[PDB]
Amino acid sequence: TIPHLAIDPFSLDFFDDPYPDQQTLRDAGPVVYLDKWNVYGVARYAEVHAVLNDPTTFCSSRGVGLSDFKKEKPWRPPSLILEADPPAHTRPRAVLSKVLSPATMKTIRDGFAAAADAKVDELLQRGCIDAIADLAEAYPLSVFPDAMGLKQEGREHLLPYAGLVFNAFGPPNELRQTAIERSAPHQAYVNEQCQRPNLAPGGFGACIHAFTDTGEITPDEAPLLVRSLLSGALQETVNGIGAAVYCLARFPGELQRLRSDPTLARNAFEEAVRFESPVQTFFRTTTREVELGGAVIGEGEKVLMFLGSANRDPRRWSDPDLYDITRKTSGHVGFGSGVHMCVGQLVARLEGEVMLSALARKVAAIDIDGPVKRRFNNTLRGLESLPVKLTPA
Numbered sequence: 358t359i360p361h362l363a364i365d366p367f368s369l370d371f372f373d374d375p376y377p378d379q380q381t382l383r384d385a386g387p388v389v390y391l392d393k394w395n396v397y398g399v400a401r402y403a404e405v406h407a408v409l410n411d412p413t414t415f416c417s418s419r420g421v422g423l424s425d426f427k428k429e430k431p432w433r434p435p436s437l438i439l440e441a442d443p444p445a446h447t448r449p450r451a452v453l454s455k456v457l458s459p460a461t462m463k464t465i466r467d468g469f470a471a472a473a474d475a476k477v478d479e480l481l482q483r484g485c486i487d488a489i490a491d492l493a494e495a496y497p498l499s500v501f502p503d504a505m506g507l508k509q510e511g512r513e514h515l516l517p518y519a520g521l522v523f524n525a526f527g528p529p530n531e532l533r534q535t536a537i538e539r540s541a542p543h544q545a546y547v548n549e550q551c552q553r554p555n556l557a558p559g560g561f562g563a564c565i566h567a568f569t570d571t572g573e574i575t576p577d578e579a580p581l582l583v584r585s586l587l588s589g590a591l592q593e594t595v596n597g598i599g600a601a602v603y604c605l606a607r608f609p610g611e612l613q614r615l616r617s618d619p620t621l622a623r624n625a626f627e628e629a630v631r632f633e634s635p636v637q638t639f640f641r642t643t644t645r646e647v648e649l650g651g652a653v654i655g656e657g658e659k660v661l662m663f664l665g666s667a668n669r670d671p672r673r674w675s676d677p678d679l680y681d682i683t684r685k686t687s688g689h690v691g692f693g694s695g696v697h698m699c700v701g702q703l704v705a706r707l708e709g710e711v712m713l714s715a716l717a718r719k720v721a722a723i724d725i726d727g728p729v730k731r732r733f734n735n736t737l738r739g740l741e742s743l744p745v746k747l748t749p750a
């Protein structure tokens with residue numbers, strides 16, 4: 358009843374151009390079986406949204422990667438929020454929700470927006486830049502580690518550790534084992550900065566440690582929650598911002614609309630998150646026998662959700678291949694959906710909005726003037742290099 362496909366969604370050929378294979382996954386049926394890795398797969402919006410909103414049946418405590426924690430040892434101590442289910446997930450989620458709260462965005466927005474404008478002005482003085490290294494990477498690295506309260510030393514480990522984490526979500530291919538092989542220095546840095554004495558006061562990290570006396574988290578749980586913000590926060594935001602610049606360069610009409618109405622910046626970033634889906638895939642594990650899309654999935658089975666394919670499903674999105682900054686993006690699963698929906702989505706949207714606002718007000722045109730290079734990751738989609746020319750407005 359379930360179609361069996363030999364597509365490896367973790368191969369270099371797939372990462373190079375995933376969209377033809379993603380249609381094959383969607384059109385094959387609501388639930389497919391991937392013979393290459395012995396997992397179930399869902400690529401349509403309806404089933405992906407269903408799995409995300411049923412954490413009782415499709416749990417995360419057995420790992421959101423290919424590895425089943427009930428069967429294999431996790432390469433690192435499990436995340437207290439990402440790899441946890443209710444009720445254990447509830448209170449650590451509430452702490453991160455209050456640390457990355459709306460009231461916290463008001464305290465950092467002016468500094469984030471000013472740094473976004475200062476970066477664009479600096480890039481306009483060079484003209485020909487790398488929109489990845491000099492914009493997509495350079496701007497979040499200039500606001501987020503400071504907002505975290507991290508010291509200046511060792512910040513070169515942040516992005517390598519982020520790519521290691523998302524590579525480790527994948528199957529035991531060469532991408533994952535090479536990353537884990539080179540992991541020792543990045544792990545040592547990240548784990549050390551999670552300790553309270555190493556976090557500057559007022560930052561996100563110190564605020565997490567300050568939440569240890571409410572009864573929601575304990576002091577021994579605080580370093581792991583800080584590790585969450587050092588694992589998944591930078592690279593996907595970089596990939597999202599880098600995707601927006603990419604889209605604005607490939608769809609010059611949308612850049613012209615954004616220039617005419619800079620208030621579209623927040624939705625221009627949200628649509629970039631839907632269009633690119635920096636987090637392409639995540640796993641869930643069935644805690645019981647479940648029927649989904651007419652298929653009976655046994656207990657203890659890994660289910661692979663194609664978030665990027667769910668964001669391009671024509672059963673849900675009109676013209677899903679088109680970057681539209683005025684599209685009603687409400688409902689996309691680029692940040693997940695349900696109890697695990699990205700708790701740091703306000704930080705990412707703020708970083709993305711003020712950067713696109715700075716571009717909308719200062720840049721007249723973005724023209725690719727060099728070889729575009731893609732960075733391959735088991736979980737993340739993003740560019741390695743985006744050589745662009747920036748014309749001042």
Ligand code: HEM
Binds near residue numbers: 597698
């Ligand atoms: C474009 C930017 C981002 C994207 C695309 C993204 C993507 C995602 C997705 C899809 C999930 C759901 C995981 C799941 O359902 O298993 C998630 C969860 C999470 N994200 Fe993000 N994220 C982004 C930015 C951030 C930022 C800026 C932070 C922190 C400052 C952050 C921290 C987290 C945490 C802690 C979780 C776990 C939440 C939970 O398990 O309840 N992310 N992210």
Ligand SMILES: O=C(O)c1ccc(CO)cc1
Binds near residue numbers: 436589593
């Ligand atoms: O808890 C974590 O370490 C963690 C890691 C990666 C993600 C993906 O956004 C979310 C949370």
Ligand SMILES: [Cl-]
Binds near residue numbers: 433
């Ligand atoms: Cl670690």
